[PDB]
């Protein structure tokens, strides 16, 4: 009782005209001018993406980690610009640098929470400060990390992962084959580079409790030093406090008193 698809009658291709070609260039022509080279070119190091008109740039933390005099190159011109480090998140592998230039081509952020697997994406990078380097693929898997069968390599690392509108869906990140690459989603990139520009680094948030998940001991279902308590899904509470951002307000849930407590995640 094997179900089967109907017989294939027609076959649709790209324009069969002897006069026209099929290309993705118009969809990517603009975003390429916002992807820059990053050097200290014979010996370069990673790519970067302009995110502000006044000269703010995003790259991977591993791209810049170790250098002393960061220089960038923009599509066109060919002039080199002195770049100064603004922030560096080690966990997120994100860093922000700045150059002294105005009216730069910037990239527009796409909402990485509205993408689906199968979406057409392009990995743009400027590996050696002479031209672009685009690779084509699709969104392979979703969540925290975007998997794509587009070539994500050290040349593309720190570069732009865009959709078919040219909008930034993520920042490429080359890690150590399988033909599958990774990219830091744009929503995460958006939140990180604001905190790095404003405060200079990423401020987390800390309660002072060790968490664990219930599995067999399901019952009815301070700050300065130590604690070992439980909670529902002991993975969302660490993300809610790391996003709590230093000295806010606190809410919690009941169990008993202090240690061996249970925190229920909900509102503010």
């Amino acid at each position: 009782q094997i179900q089967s698809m109907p017989k294939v009658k027609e076959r649709v291709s790209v324009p069969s005209k002897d006069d026209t070609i099929y290309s993705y260039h118009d969809s990517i022509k603009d975003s390429i001018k916002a992807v820059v080279n990053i050097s200290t070119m014979e010996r370069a190091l990673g790519s970067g993406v302009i995110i502000s008109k006044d000269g703010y740039i995003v790259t991977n933390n591993h791209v810049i980690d170790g250098a002393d005099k960061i220089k960038v190159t923009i599509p066109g011109s060919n002039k080199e610009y002195s770049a100064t480090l603004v922030g560096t998140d080690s966990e997120s592998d994100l860093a922000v640098i700045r150059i002294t230039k105005d009216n730069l081509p910037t990239i527009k952020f796409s909402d990485s929470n509205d993408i689906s697997v199968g979406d057409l994406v392009f990995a743009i990078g400027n590996p050696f400060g002479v031209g672009e380097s685009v690779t084509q693929g699709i969104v392979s898997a979703l969540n925290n990390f975007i998997q794509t069968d587009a070539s994500i390599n050290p040349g593309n690392s720190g570069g732009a992962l865009i959709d078919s509108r040219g909008g930034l869906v993520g920042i490429n990140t080359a890690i150590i084959n399988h033909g599958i690459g990774f990219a830091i989603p744009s929503n995460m990139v958006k939140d990180t580079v604001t905190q790095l520009i404003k405060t200079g680094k990423i401020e987390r948030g800390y309660l002072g409790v060790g968490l664990q998940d219930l599995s067999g001991d399901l019952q009815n279902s301070w700050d300065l030093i130590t604690e070992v308590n439980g909670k529902k899904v002991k993975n969302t509470n660490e993300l809610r406090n790391l996003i709590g951002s230093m000295l806010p307000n606190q809410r919690v849930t009941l169990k008993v008193i202090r240690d061996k407590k249970e925190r229920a995640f909900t509102l503010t």
Binding site: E203, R204, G205, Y206, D223, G244, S245, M246, L247
Partner: peptide, 4 residues
């Protein structure tokens, strides 16, 4: 790495 710490806060309140």
């Amino acid at each position: 790495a710490a806060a309140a």
